Amino acid sequence: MYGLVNKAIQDMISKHHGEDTWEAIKQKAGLEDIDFFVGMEAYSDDVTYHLVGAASEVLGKPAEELLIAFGEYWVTYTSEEGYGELLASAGDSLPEFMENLDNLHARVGLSFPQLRPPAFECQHTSSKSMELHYQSTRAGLAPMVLGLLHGLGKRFQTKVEVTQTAFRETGEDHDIFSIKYE
Numbered sequence: 001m002y003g004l005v006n007k008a009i010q011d012m013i014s015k016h017h018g019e020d021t022w023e024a025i026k027q028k029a030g031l032e033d034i035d036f037f038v039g040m041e042a043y044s045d046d047v048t049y050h051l052v053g054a055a056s057e058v059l060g061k062p063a064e065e066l067l068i069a070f071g072e073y074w075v076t077y078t079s080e081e082g083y084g085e086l087l088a089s090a091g092d093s094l095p096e097f098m099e100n101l102d103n104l105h106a107r108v109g110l111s112f113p114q115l116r117p118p119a120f121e122c123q124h125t126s127s128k129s130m131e132l133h134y135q136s137t138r139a140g141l142a143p144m145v146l147g148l149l150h151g152l153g154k155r156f157q158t159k160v161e162v163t164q165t166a167f168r169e170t171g172e173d174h175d176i177f178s179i180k181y182e
């Protein structure tokens with residue numbers, strides 16, 4: 001994925017656990033070569049997973065867990081580090097922002113074509129409930145979506161309960177989440 005995701009992981013770990021740890025996780029992930037990640041450069045999705053795997057061991061936490069944390073962090077990180085207005089242009093509420101993703105990503109891919117964006121459909125069951133379909137060319141990032149949602153919940157001071165009712169990794173076509181929100 002574009003370096004942007006890898007810098008984010010690095011920024012989070014470093015900020016929460018110091019460079020010593022980050023350097024460690026980097027060496028273990030077998031990436032002690034890469035002196036630094038380039039934001040607008042396309043890397044092999046495997047580069048990210050390796051960082052997730054190494055961070056899992058080095059921190060004694062499970063991948064799925066860190067992915068949740070990274071989900072939340074991403075929403076904050078992007079607004080700060082050069083993507084505030086892009087995010088601001090996505091809406092003034094969770095439900096709206098989620099409908100804008102497909103648009104938002106298209107909007108982004110234009111600048112960066114090697115972008116392989118996921119699809120996000122939404123059936124608004126009610127005015128406080130919606131069903132989210134997450135479709136991706138990657139595997140094992142459902143947990144990050146979980147974090148992403150909560151991050152959006154904080155961004156719009158909205159209480160939100162997210163629970164996953166279908167999992168790709170277990171055969172099912174694609175991940176599906178059920179969402180309740182204040």
Ligand SMILES: O=C(O)CCCCN(CCc1cc(F)ccc1OCc1ccc(-c2ccc(C(F)(F)F)cc2)cc1)Cc1ccc(C(=O)O)cc1
Nearest residue numbers: 001002004039040078112115116117118136137138148149
């Ligand atoms: O793999 C999957 O299925 C998706 C895994 C989850 C990661 N995606 C989160 C989507 C999301 C969900 C959400 F709920 C809130 C916010 C969200 O993001 C807002 C946002 C998304 C992207 C940029 C941005 C900014 C700059 C750049 C570039 F560097 F210039 F290229 C590139 C992307 C900014 C803000 C983003 C994503 C998607 C594809 C690629 C790639 O294909 O590499 C990289 C990252």
